[PDB]
Each structure stands twice: as C-alpha cells, then as structure tokens.
Design a binder for this molecule. Structure first.
Ligand SMILES: Nc1nc2c(ncn2[C@@H]2O[C@H](COP(=O)(O)OP(=O)(O)OP(=O)(O)O)[C@@H](O)[C@H]2O)c(=O)[nH]1
Ligand SMILES: Nc1nc2c(ncn2[C@@H]2O[C@H](COP(=O)(O)OP(=O)(O)O)[C@@H](O)[C@H]2O)c(=O)[nH]1
Ligand SMILES: Nc1nc2c(ncn2[C@@H]2O[C@H](COP(=O)(O)OP(=O)(O)O)[C@@H](O)[C@H]2O)c(=O)[nH]1
Lengths: 428, 267, 434, 95, 428
C-alpha cells in the first residue's frame, strides 16, 4: 500500500491537477460530496493511493494546490468537484508571479515554499511507504516554472529516494502565449535535470493536433484538451490503484525507462482515441490500439519520432484482454520500425497490464517513450534562448530580483550539455 | 480567414457538430424524462417548502398548546448599524442549497432564517408542542417549558446548545439555532415578558396571541435574535440569520431585536 | 484584493477618468448614487465597500484649477466620488511645466500624497498605479512630474502604468506643447515602468473612418480611451483562460529600462449600424489591429520594426482562433519583428464582453486591445524634437519658464536625454551582425 | 454640455449571460473519450474471471463451432467476459 | 472525594471564570439554574470536585469571585449563566487597583483580603478533602495581581498541603494592552514562585496566534480566547471528574512534571482545534491529536519550545482510545525530535487517558509541558522592567503607595535568578 502525493503549481498546473481529480474520482467512485457511491470493491481495496480516509466515509485527495496568483483558487473551488479538497491544502498567495522565473525563485515564491513545505510534510508523515511525488506544472510561464522547481529541489533534498514524476507543459513552436518562455522554461529545465526522475514533456500544439487530426473536434477548449493529459497521467499509475497481471509501478517504469540518470526526458501518449463519428464504429482490438498508439500523431510533445531513434518505449495497458496480442504486436512494431529503434538495446519495450479499464471504456493503453526526438523541443528552445539572450533582452526584470548574470550562461551550458549525449544516440 | 458557420449548415465540421448536438440533446432529454435534473429537484423542493397552510383560530386572545402559531420579529426603529433589513420578518426553515442538493432533506443540522414574508407559507408555520406533561388544549404560560416543531411527515424541532469551537452562527460567531429530529432537553424553549421590571409577577399568566414576548432557551439563558446587520444569501430571496444571545440595553432591558411576536389566525 | 489606484492628472486626466469611471459604473452594477441596484466580488478592484452599500472609487482626480473638477461634484455623478478624493487648486499652470513643477506644486502635493496614502491604507494587495495625463498643459505635465518625483521615491517597488495623451504631430492644440513634452519625457523617463501612448489626431481619423461620424463630439475620444482601459484593466476583475496581471504588461512589453512606450489599438470600433452584418471573427479582429491605420498614435509601423506585442482578448473568444490569427500574422511579411524577440506575443483572455455605454460604439461579443512596443515611435519622438530645435534655436517663450524657477540648462538636459533616447531606439533597432 | 452629454441611464441593467456561457464553453467530461456504450459495471479481476466465478455462464460451454468467414474457432475467443456483478466480497459491508 | 475551591481575581480573572464555570456546567449538565437536566449518570457521580449541593437538586459552583471594582462582578451576575453562583460568594470593594500591583498587594486589597479569606475558609472547610484551590488571574494588571498574589500568599499558609494551581495570564511580547504591565508582572512572579505548585502560563497573544492560525477565526472575540483557556482548565481535572483508565489527578501532573521545587511554569495547549469548515475533512485519530498538541502553534504561551528544551511534558487524553497508540505516539515523538527534550530524565512524559470525551469530539487532549523556553518570558519582562526602573518610570505611584524601591530590586533578583534554574538545566 503505497502513496503518490499529487502536487501542482501555476494556473496551468492547477487546472490540470483539477481535471486529473475528476477522472481519478470517476475511476474510484467518488462524487463531489466526498462519500463513496459506486458499484465495486476493487475501487476501495486500494483507495489509499490518492485519498486519505476521514471520518464519515469522506475521502480527501492528497493534493497540494499551489499558485502565487490567487485567482485560479476560486476557479478550482468553482469546478463541480470543488467540495473534495481540504481548505488547508489550498495554499494561497497574495501577489502575482508576473511571468517571471526569478519572481518565483528568489522572491515571494521563496517565502511561500515554507508553508508549502509544511503542508507536504504534514501529509507525508500520514503514510506508511510514500512512493513519491507527482508535480504537474508549466515549464513556460511563472509560478510553477520557478516556485514549482523550488518545491522540486526542496522535496528532492528532503526525501532523496522517492520517485518524482513531473508532468511539464513545454512551450510550443507555432504559438507562444508568453514572450519570456525561452527564459522561464530553460531556467526551469536546469533545475529539472539534477532533481526529478521522470519528466513528461506535454505540448499544447501536439494536443491541439490530436484534437483536430485525431479527435476531430471544432472548438477544443482547455478542458477538452486538458483532459487528455489527465487521462495519460491517470493511466501511468494504474497497477497501484487496480490489480492486474504483470503489474508495474513508477519505479517499474523508471528502472526500465531511463538508461542514464540524466536521460530522463520522455514524451507521453494515450491513444484509445477516436471521434464521436467513428466512436460507435471502432472495433477495439490490441493491434488497433498499438497501431494508433505508435503513430506519430497521438504523441503529446511537438516532436517527430520519425526524426530520431527511440531509446525505450513502454505501453501500460489496461483492460480485460489477451496479452499474447500485446506481446507479438509490439514485437511486430519493433521488428517493422527497426531503424527508429536503437540497435544497442534489444527488447526495448516494457509491457504491463492492468485488469480494470477506465470507466466508460472497454480497454485503454498509455504510451511512455524515452526518445532522442526531444531535441526538436530542447535544441529549439536553445536557439530561442541564445537569439534572445545575445541582445541582453528582457533582462532587468530578471537581474534586479536578486539574481546574477552568469547563471543564464550556466543554464545555456547545461542545456547544451543535455544536447550532447542524446545527439550521440542518433548515430550511436 | 474563413467564415466559421454554425448549426444547420452542412459545411466544415457539421458532421461532428450534429453528432455532438445529438449526444448532448439525448443526454438532456434522458435527464428530463427520468426527472433527475437540477430544476426538477428545485421545483419539487420548492413546492414541498412553499405549500400553503392555515393558522389556528384564536377563540380567545391566548395561544394554546398544539396550535399552528408562526414566529415573527416586528419592525424596528433601531439604528445601531446603517445596514438594516426590512420589518416584520418571520422565522423560516432554510436548508442549505448545495449540501442538500441530492436526496430528500438534510439531517440534524438544517438552518433557520427570518424571511420578509407575513403569510403562513408552510416553511414558517410552527406547532407549539407540549414538551412536558400537558394536552392539546391547554394555554401556553409565561415561563413554561414549551417546544417548537415544524415538518415527508417528520417533525423537526427547534434546538440549540452551548457554544463550542465546532459550530456557531454562520455569519456571526454566536450560538446556533438549528432543526433537529431528536428529542432531548435541548429542544425546549420558554417565553418571558419584555419589561424586566414587570416580568416576574407576570410569570404564571397566559400569553396573548400577537404580543411582544422573549424566547429563552432553558439550557443557556439566551434569547432568539435576528441579526439584522448582515444577510444570508439563500434561494428564497435574501434574508437574515437568527441566533441565541440575550442583548441588554441601558436599563437591563432587551433590545427590539431580542423581541419575538407570535402570530395566530385573526381574520 | 487585487486593486490599483487610478491617478488622473490635469484637465485631460480628469475627463479621461470621467469617461472610464462611467464605463466602470455601467460595467458593474454601480448606480450613480453609489449603490448597486438591490442585488461577484469583481467590484473590489475599483470600488471600496461601505456600510449601507456605498461603493466608492479608489481614484484621485487632481487638477490645479477649478471649473473642470468643480462641475464633477455638480453633475450627474455628484454622489459617487469621495469629496476629498477630487482635489482642486486655485490657479492653473497656464500651459507651463515651470509653473506645474517648480511654483504651483507644493501647496497641493502634500494633500495629494495624503489622499494617496489614505487610499493605499485601504488596500490589501495594492497592485500599483494607473496615471492618466497629458503632454500638453502645465497642469498635466509639471504636476505629474512632481508626482513621479514623490511617489517613485516613496513606493519604489510598485507597478506603474501611464496612459499618456501624446501631442498630435499635425493638428495639435497648443504652442508650448514641445516644451512641456520635452520636459516631461526627461523627468518621467526613469520613473515610469510602462507608458501606453494615445494621440488625438489618430482618433480624429478613427471616428471618421470607422465610426462613420463626420461630426462627433470630443467626448468620443476618451470614450474610446475608456474602452481601452476597461480592456486592459479587466483580467484582474473577471476570470478567463489567460489571466494577465499588470506585471506581465511590463514583463512582456518593457525589455530595457528606458524603452517603455507601447502604442495601443482597439477593435470593433463599429458604430451599431454596421454591426449585425459582419462575422467579427478572431482572425479579422486581429487583422484590424495589425492593419497600420487603426493605431492610437499617428505613426505607421511599416516605417519601423515591432519589439513585443501584448493582445488582450475579451468576450466569446476561444484561445485557438487566437492561435491561428497569431500564426497567420507571423506568416504575414509586411508585419515583421526584430530578430532578437521571436516569441513576441503575450496573450491575455477574459470572458466578459465589453459593456457598451449608450452612445456610438456597438454591442460586440469579441474585443481585443493590442499593446505593441515598437521602434516606429522614434519617428514620432523625432518630429517633436525637430519642432523643439526649431523653437529653441532663438529662445522663444523661454522667459515665462525661467521666471518661474525653471533653470535654463535643464532644457539642454531634456534635449540631450531625448537625443540619447533616439540613440537607444536605433541600437535597439538594427539586427544581429555578431 | 455636461448634463446634455452625460445623462444618467436608468433601466440600463448590464447582462451577465455571455461571460457565463463562454465559461461554459471553455470547460463533456466523459463524452470526449467515452467508447461505444456507457457501462459503469465493467470491472472483473483476472483471478475472479478465470478462477472463483468459474467462467462465462451464457457463453457456449461446448458449442465451439467453426466460423468460416473469420477463419478461426470464434465462439470462445469472441467471448470477453463481462457478466455478473463485480468482485464485491464483503469489504463494502465491513467499511 | 476531592473537591476544588475555585478562585478568580480581576476582569480577565472573572471573565475566564465565566467561561470555566460555563464549560464545566455544560459538561456536568447543570443548567443556568442548577437542576441536572442531563443524561449519563456518570455526570452527577463526581460533581463534588467543582460543585456543592444546595436544596433540591441545585448545584452552586464552588467559586470565590473577587474584584476591586463593583463592575466586572455585575456583568458576571447579570450575564447568562450568572445566577448559578451563590450571591455571597461574589466579593468586591468600592475602590480600585488602577493597574497598580501596589494598590492591590498592600493598600486596597488588604481591607478586602479578610472578606475573601472568610468565604474561602467556609467553602474549603465544608468539604471531605480539598484536593486544592485553583486561581485564575492576569499577572498584567492590578487586583488579580496584587490582591490575587496576597490571596495565594495568605491562603498557602493556612493550607500548606493543597495543590494551589494557577492559570496566570502573563503579559505578551508584541501586544501590550496596559503600560505599567512591566512592573505588575515582574512584581508578582516572586510571589507566584513561593506560593503556587503548578503555575500554568497562558498569554493573550498566543491564544490569538491559535484563533487566527489554527481555528481560522476572522473576528477573534475575547469570548473565543477565554474558551481555549477553559478547554485546558477542564482537561487538567478530567480524570478526577469522569471515571477512566490510567486516571491522573492534579498532584500526579505535578509529581511527573515539576523536576525541582522552584521550576513550575508550564506552557498549556489543547489539541482537536480545527476550523469549522475543515471539521468535515479530518480524522480524530490519536496521531492527529498528538501532531497538534506538540506543534509550535497549539501552545498557549509565547515561548516556542524549539528555542529551548522540555524538562517534562504531561498529556491528559479525554476519550476512549487504544492505549497502544497513545503510548506508541509518546515514545515516537520523544525519539524522533530528540534535541527538544532534555537527556537527564528517561521517559520525560506522563500519559493519562480519561474516558468521557468533551461533547462533540470523539477524542481530545490537554498539554502541560515544563519547558526551559519559559526563560524567554521572564527575560522579555525583565528586559522591559529594567529598561524602565533605571529611570524611576511610572514609579511615583508604586512607591508612595506604602512601599519601597528595594522590593523592586529583589523582584528583578528572584526573576533574574529563576532565569538561571531554567538555564543550567537547559544544558545538563
Ligand atoms: N474625451 C475628452 N478629452 C478631452 C476633452 N477636453 C480635453 N481633452 C483632453 O485634454 C487635453 C488638454 O488638456 P491639458 O493639456 O491636460 O490641460 P491642463 O494640463 O489642465 O492645463 P490647462 O490648459 O492650463 O488647464 C487634450 O489634448 C485632450 O486630449 C473632452 O472634452 N473630452
Ligand atoms: N493540459 C492543460 N494545459 C493547460 C491548462 N491550463 C493552461 N494550459 C496551458 O498553459 C499555458 C500557460 O500557463 P501559464 O501562464 O504559464 O500558467 P502560470 O504557471 O500560472 O504562469 C497555456 O499556453 C495553456 O495552453 C490545463 O488546464 N490543462
Ligand atoms: N482570555 C481572556 N483574557 C482577557 C479577557 N479580558 C481581558 N483579558 C486580558 O486581561 C488583560 C487586562 O486585564 P486587567 O486590566 O488586568 O483586569 P484587572 O485585573 O481587573 O485589572 C488584557 O491584557 C487582556 O488581554 C477575556 O475575556 N479572556
């Protein structure tokens, strides 16, 4: 019986944490009033993965609601599942992040991390074996970019052996809702690369491409987009909440997925996905799941798998099925797209099956892939950072907050340091 | 850019538009036919809490036991706070309109208010029950242990107890008055005279129908008060809360918002 | 909790404030008596509560002279504004920075700071100051100069947004406008955090092309300015997808601490007879802003290079048509950026459509205020600098200034600092060669 | 000029419909991923299926015919056990 | 049995008396008139401890309400539960202290001290065996201080074996309701030391800290503040008033929490304090009550322990709990945090478990801990007192009122002294 603490910061990380909690509550049978009203008992067998039991049958999520701007708090309480969190776990802040990484790193974020640390402590001692932490935030922007990395660094220093999964919203190349994303996200990536163990780079343009050219919608709003991230981030940690054959936890994913400690940059995928038109006409089979998974369209980062060899690939499956088709269908894709796999790792695909499918679905599967195609993200933001840092641009907002010049150079140096050993895998 | 058309026109994403419209329309008609939607629940709860009743006839100008008598708080000239609220308010039932939502009626805490209505409307009609040993015909006496009940066919009773750091009045922080279903000593109130000089001799006398009396909970010696400064935002208009704390003035006299008049049928 | 103080300096400033506070009153409930009509907390950004529900503004309306503020407490809003908030003088500066800054400043600056302090006490989180003033009259120039020299010392950590009435390059309304502008730019360049710029000749064009009104009153210009400020100060009032606080304006539009001058642009400028015949889509509502004719300032950006633009959308807008419009604009060649700020868009989104005052603009469900910091404004600056050189070549109107305590050499300082500002403009300008 | 151009506006009550409806559009919670038919009772463990619930009872216990048009012995492979209540055993009553 | 004669002196004293007598009444059921309109028969069992039976099921609180101005008494009488106290028990005089510990310990109190001692003797003698008197006063301010200390003094001599406890309300650091408080306080500790057995040190500032931080109240009224001090006052007498396992009266909490005879200033703190809107999201498990009564907030004094060390700690749990857990928690904390506890005493903790819980709560617990941190207080007071006498400040009164300057000197002596006891034991 093992716990994942779900912590989320920023106005993006907050609302993905919110949207995560309805799909977890529907999978575990919890209504907005907090009582269990469902049909099974497997949903209560391992309810102590996300929900602390209270008096009167009230299950309360072990979530930490963080942001510097006190505006998304009223929204996350305004959602339909608003009367489910502690009003102590909403940690407020009466200022603005101001779209500044230094503002969350060396100022009022750094005086709010003490209260957030007290909250994460007081929940952390209410466990028997805490498996780890799960931060959802946005790399580009404020609050969660800087002060989320404060929380990452502090809890990594305080618990040094717990599995850290961070779902990070990288900026998009086509559209950017923020000028200072090449500053914020690079300075956040430096803090990520000696800290967390499992990143998940999630791109808004990739999600929008899934919404049009896979989901085939017309007005994809943030909630409709946002839920896909919620679904993959529910499907990764499913063998801990529901039983199955050949289970897998987050360390099970990690020890199979990261070859080197620095090579911990994934990009995810959740594809039992289809349009409302094709919905009644899907003939759900394991080959049909695998083929539509491994296609370079459902991939949740703005990166092309055809431009780079996969290091390792995991398919956390869910549903009542025969896993023989699972085994030889991923064998077939491994042997077919052989040039897109590295030759120095045989059998680079992790298989795992959960018995219980998500509610309303017959079966599903979550793709987690360590690829060398992450360069179309990281190198891209590196040219953005260099071409903007050369003219010393937008800088006084960063250097006047108590921040020296040369750790920008350290950030660029240790992002180009990420560039090297994964360029190396393109030509072995 | 493009023209970005809407419903009916067969261009662009019209196919998935009509698919989503049919799915949402099917969900709405399914909920409408099964009668599980929010406004249907609202209408049922409203008819149940707004069903009209009748007031007992006062054959003599005295309130008896077991008769349907409404609690009203009279109009006030008090100006101790600028934010005032109306006159001739009434003690009414207020179940909370999100924590109720589902099911049929809440439990041991319900909540009381004082609306601006003067007609007997069903959520404000109280039966003056017996508490101690009496019958359906005896007259209520000054300083006698009477009881207030209101109805699903389940008699809820007006109740309160002492102040702890778990519960209080909602907007203020004083004692809470709430509707229980249990039966104990906490349900019991009493009546007393407004004037503290000519009170103790009137102890042991009948109560007039429409007259100023004070209601004291006989476990804490606190009087029923309509906290006119503030407001409770509930569905049935906007009205005030009611609590229990004896407010005194410059003569050990009770302020006009301690006072509570009772209402019988006087056509 | 998220409040800001609106300072309204000059005759220009008090009537800008009149128009925008009328728009805020109609935006919220706020009847002109001071109470919302019978029967969420979005008012608690511009309106302080009071017992018996008298929502009072947090603004200050300062003028060095009567009449214009005297009629405010007499007209149709006589009960709304607090009587000590509206500050009146007894003698106008008479179009003179010397009188506004060195002689008639001191009997009123203590009262203005006292009012500012008492407003700032009643603020949990004060976000900063929004000042509205002219580069014209001495009341609008010198008093706000002294106001910066006081408040930037007193409140040096706070956010500061100016909404400057820049003098028209062609028509104008005064003869000492180059003097007043050249002095106020010098004395407020180092103290301003971000200064959005609005002109009168440009909106003179706007009301005859897009309003289709050949004879509009002069109230319509600050009615449109009221629409601009109600668009920019709206994310701290309501809720949206991209919620933009006042700090992101400076963060994404002021890269360097001398260049802080963006130009605004509105959209749906439609006048209610050509409103129910068009799509008013997001693509064209962005293309109308980025067309080089709807600017607040008569300076086309074809003869310039954009630095950073911040779009604030409000109403029935989904973020992804905004994304498509941004992609289309970045593919358009005639609109072109500098090579050192490639990601040059800041998107803020609010869901409330603009409430329309009974008047000229139309009821539209989509609006966007586009705040572009650009290098084109160097031409508009250098035009008044050329007029200033031609005016100062033989010492015209200098005796009025120097008789009021204004030192002569500070004129040369002002011209030198504006020349250095032209310089800073050009090397912010040209592309990468290294 | 002032009273002539800045008349008060009685009866000009602002509306709140559009911001609320735009909020409604910007947040269809299961209807985005939901497959062929809603079924909240769609959970049986592998031990419960292939162990102590025997097997699928409506399914063909010995009528294993040869479907030709899908060239395989279909009536057992195309079963996919979904019968019965879930694997409730007494934990609900104990809690 | 073992009755407890209650003594209250001063406004604060009589107002903390209002709540204590109200709280003990709610518990034992006694109404605002006396009749036991209650239920469980255990309630009337041990009523002697705090009540005396009048005529016909009428219980009259055993209290000697004292004040030097005929005013606070009237609010108490003309208040709600105010006709439960015998008319004569109320003692008062038509004069006044005037925040002058002098005009209380020698001038006005003298003429009235005889009166109170008469009432005290009557109640004390008319009993099977007085467990001990119990005084509630405000070291800051007169009457309660002067007349009060004079009582503990004259009272201690007559009865030299009865637990003379005291719920003194020491002055606060930041907040400073009065101005002479400095002298008043410093001038009473010398008396308290050589008079009281257990002197609990509650501070108005700490009660606030809790209200604001813990309870999350927004308009903390002095009523709620008197409630936290009454909650504790009842916990220290729960065992001798409600049958339970591991019973522990007052002298037990003094024989396992007063190391040396002069070290007796304990800092109190209740436990199940949670916001009204968070009461639904919690679990009254022994762990919770512990995690609370030991944090540096639930304390009712302004001397955080962390700074210093605990010479002892006493906990009285009010609820039907599992001995194992109660015991386990004690060992755990003692072991985990092992630098905030002294080392010269093994098992530095007394555990007690009264059954009958406080109405409304499944469990609960009061805390009485002798901590060397208490040094912080006497210092702050001394700091101020000495930062005044140096320039005979506000002294004219204290002097000519029939006193002398030497006493002031020795008050700072016994003060600076005790500072040492709680300094040497602070370090082996
Ligand atoms: N909307 C609107 N704006 C106005 C109106 N009248 C003047 N303005 C603005 O006010 C500006 C001139 O005022 P200022 O230069 O500030 O005058 P001043 O600073 O008070 O100095 P004095 O002229 O001595 O009073 C013009 O440039 C306009 O932009 C008006 O009636 N309506
Ligand atoms: N999947 C998902 N993505 C989101 C959500 N909310 C925002 N985003 C993306 O987050 C980006 C901006 O977040 P940001 O302004 O940095 O939030 P901040 O950290 O509070 O400053 C936008 O470009 C959105 O596309 C969400 O709720 N779910
Ligand atoms: N806990 C509590 N403390 C109080 C109350 N009323 C007053 N105090 C404290 O008592 C102190 C002053 O009391 P004081 O003037 O000495 O009363 P006196 O002894 O009659 O002179 C103030 O610092 C208050 O903080 C109360 O109702 N409850």
């Amino acid at each position: 019986m093992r716990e994942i603490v779900h912590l989320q910061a920023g106005q993006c990380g907050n609302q993905i944490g919110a949207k995560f909690w309805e799909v977890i509550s529907d999978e575990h049978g919890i209504d907005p009033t907090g009582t269990y009203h469902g049909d099974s008992d497997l949903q209560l067998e391992r309810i102590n993965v996300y929900y602390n039991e209270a008096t009167g049958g009230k299950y309360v999520p072990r979530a930490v609601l963080v942001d510097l701007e006190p505006g998304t708090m009223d929204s996350v309480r305004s959602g339909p599942f608003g009367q489910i969190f502690r009003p102590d776990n909403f940690v407020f802040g009466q200022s603005g992040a101001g779209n500044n990484w230094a503002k969350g790193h060396y100022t009022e974020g750094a005086e709010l991390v003490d209260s957030v640390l007290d909250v994460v402590r007081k929940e952390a001692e209410s466990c028997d074996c805490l498996q780890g932490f799960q931060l959802t935030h946005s790399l580009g922007g404020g609050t969660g970019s800087g002060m989320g990395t404060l929380l990452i660094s502090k809890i990594r220093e305080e618990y040094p052996d717990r599995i850290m999964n961070t779902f990070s919203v990288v900026p998009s190349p086509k559209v950017s809702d923020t000028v200072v994303e090449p500053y914020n996200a690079t300075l956040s990536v430096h803090q990520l690369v000696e800290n967390t163990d499992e990143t998940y780079c999630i791109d808004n343009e990739a999600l929008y491409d899934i919404c049009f050219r896979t989901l085939k919608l017309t007005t994809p709003t943030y909630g409709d987009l946002n839920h896909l991230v919620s679904a993959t981030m529910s499907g990764v940690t499913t063998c801990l909440r529901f039983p199955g054959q050949l289970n897998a936890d987050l360390r099970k994913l990690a020890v199979n997925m990261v070859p080197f400690p620095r090579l911990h940059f994934f990009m995810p995928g959740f594809a039992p996905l289809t349009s409302r038109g094709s919905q009644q006409y899907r003939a759900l089979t394991v080959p049909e799941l695998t083929q539509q998974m491994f296609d370079a369209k459902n991939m949740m980062a703005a990166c092309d798998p055809r431009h780079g060899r996969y290091l390792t690939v995991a398919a956390v499956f869910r549903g009542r099925m025969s896993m023989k088709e699972v085994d030889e269908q991923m064998l077939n894709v491994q042997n077919k797209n052989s040039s897109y796999f590295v030759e120095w790792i045989p059998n680079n695909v992790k298989t795992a099956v959960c018995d219980i499918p998500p509610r309303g679905l017959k079966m599903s599967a979550t793709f987690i892939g360590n690829s060398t195609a992450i360069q179309e993200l990281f190198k891209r933001i590196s040219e953005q950072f260099t071409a903007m840092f050369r003219r010393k641009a937008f800088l006084h907002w960063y250097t006047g907050e108590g921040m020296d010049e040369m750790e920008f150079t350290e950030a660029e140096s240790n992002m180009n340091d990420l560039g090297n050993p994964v360029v190396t895998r393109g030509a072995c | 850019a493009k023209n970005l058309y809407g419903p009916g026109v067969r261009m662009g994403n019209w196919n998935e538009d009509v698919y989503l419209e049919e799915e949402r329309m099917r969900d709405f008609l399914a909920k409408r036919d099964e009668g599980q939607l929010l406004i249907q629940k609202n209408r049922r709860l409203k008819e149940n809490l707004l069903r009209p009743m009748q007031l007992s006839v006062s054959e003599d100008g005295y309130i008896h036991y077991g008769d349907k008598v409404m609690l009203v708080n009279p109009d006030h000239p008090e100006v101790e706070a600028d934010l005032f609220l109306g006159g001739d308010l009434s003690l009414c039932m207020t179940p909370d309109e999100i924590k109720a939502y589902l099911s049929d009626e809440l439990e041991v805490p319900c909540g009381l208010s004082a609306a601006q209505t003067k007609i007997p409307v069903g959520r404000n009609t109280f039966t003056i029950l017996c508490a101690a040993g009496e019958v359906i015909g005896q007259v209520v006496r000054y300083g006698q242990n009477f009881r207030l009940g209101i109805a699903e066919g389940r008699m809820f009773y007006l109740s309160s107890d002492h102040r702890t750091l778990m519960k209080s009045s909602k907007r203020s922080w004083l004692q809470e008055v709430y509707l229980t279903d249990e039966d104990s000593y906490l349900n019991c109130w009493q009546a007393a005279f407004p004037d503290p000089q000519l009170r103790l001799e009137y102890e042991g006398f009948p109560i007039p129908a429409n007259a100023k009396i004070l209601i004291n909970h006989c476990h804490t010696n606190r009087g029923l008060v309509a906290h006119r400064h503030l407001f409770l935002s509930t569905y049935f208009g906007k009205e005030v809360e009611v609590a229990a704390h004896t407010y005194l003035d410059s003569h050990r006299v009770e302020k006009p918002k301690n006072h509570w008049m009772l209402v019988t049928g006087n056509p | 909790q998220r409040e800001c103080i609106s300072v309204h300096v000059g005759q220009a400033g008090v009537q800008i404030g009149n128009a925008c506070w009328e728009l805020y009153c109609l935006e919220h409930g706020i009847q002109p008596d001071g109470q919302m009509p019978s029967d969420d907390d979005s008012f608690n950004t511009f309106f302080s509560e009071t017992g018996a529900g008298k929502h009072v503004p947090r603004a200050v309306f300062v003028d060095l002279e009567p009449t214009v503020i005297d009629e405010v407490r007499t007209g149709t809003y006589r009960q709304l504004f607090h009587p000590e908030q509206l500050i009146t003088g007894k003698e106008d500066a008479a179009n003179n920075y010397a009188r506004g800054h060195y002689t008639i400043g001191k009997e009123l600056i203590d009262l203005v700071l006292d009012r500012i302090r008492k407003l700032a006490d009643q603020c949990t989180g004060l976000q900063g100051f929004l000042i509205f003033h002219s580069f014209g009259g001495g009341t609008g120039s010198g008093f706000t100069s002294l106001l910066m020299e006081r408040l930037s010392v007193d409140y040096g950590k706070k956010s500061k947004l100016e909404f400057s009435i820049y003098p028209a390059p062609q028509v104008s309304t005064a003869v000492v406008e180059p003097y007043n502008s050249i002095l106020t730019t010098h004395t407020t360049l180092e103290h301003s955090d971000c200064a959005f710029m609005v002109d009168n000749e440009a909106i003179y064009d706007i009301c005859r092309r897009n309003l289709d009104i050949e004879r509009p009153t002069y109230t319509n210009l600050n009615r449109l300015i009221s629409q601009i400020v109600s668009s920019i100060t709206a994310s701290l009032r309501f809720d949206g997808a991209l919620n933009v606080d006042l700090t992101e304006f400076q963060t994404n539009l002021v890269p360097y601490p001398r260049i802080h001058f963006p130009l605004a642009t509105y959209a749906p400028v439609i006048s209610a007879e050509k409103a129910y015949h068009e799509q008013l889509s997001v693509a064209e509502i962005t293309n109308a802003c980025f067309e080089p004719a709807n600017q607040m300032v008569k300076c086309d950006p074809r003869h310039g290079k954009y630095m950073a633009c911040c779009l604030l959308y409000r109403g029935d807008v989904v973020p992804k048509d905004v994304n498509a419009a941004i992609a289309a604009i970045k593919t358009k060649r005639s609109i072109q950026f500098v090579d050192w700020c490639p990601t040059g868009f800041k998107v803020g989104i609010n869901y409330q459509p603009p409430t329309v005052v009974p008047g000229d603009l139309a009821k539209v469900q989509r609006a966007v205020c586009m705040l572009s910091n650009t290098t084109a404004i160097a031409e508009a600056w250098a035009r008044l600098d050329h007029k200033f050189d031609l005016m100062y070549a033989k010492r015209a109107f200098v005796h009025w200034y120097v008789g009021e305590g204004m030192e002569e050499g500070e004129f040369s300082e002002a011209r030198e600092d504006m020349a250095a500002l032209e310089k800073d403009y050009e090397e912010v300008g040209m592309d990468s060669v290294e | 000029i002032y009273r002539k151009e800045y008349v008060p506006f009685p009866g000009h009550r602002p509306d709140q419909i559009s911001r609320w409806y735009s909020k409604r559009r910007v947040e269809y919670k299961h209807l985005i991923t939901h497959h062929q038919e809603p079924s909240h009772h769609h959970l049986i463990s592998t031990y419960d299926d292939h162990y102590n619930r025997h097997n699928y009872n409506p399914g063909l216990p010995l009528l294993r015919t040869w479907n030709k048009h899908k060239l395989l012995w279909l009536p057992e492979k195309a079963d996919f056990p979904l019968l019965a209540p879930p694997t409730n055993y007494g934990l609900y009553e104990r809690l």
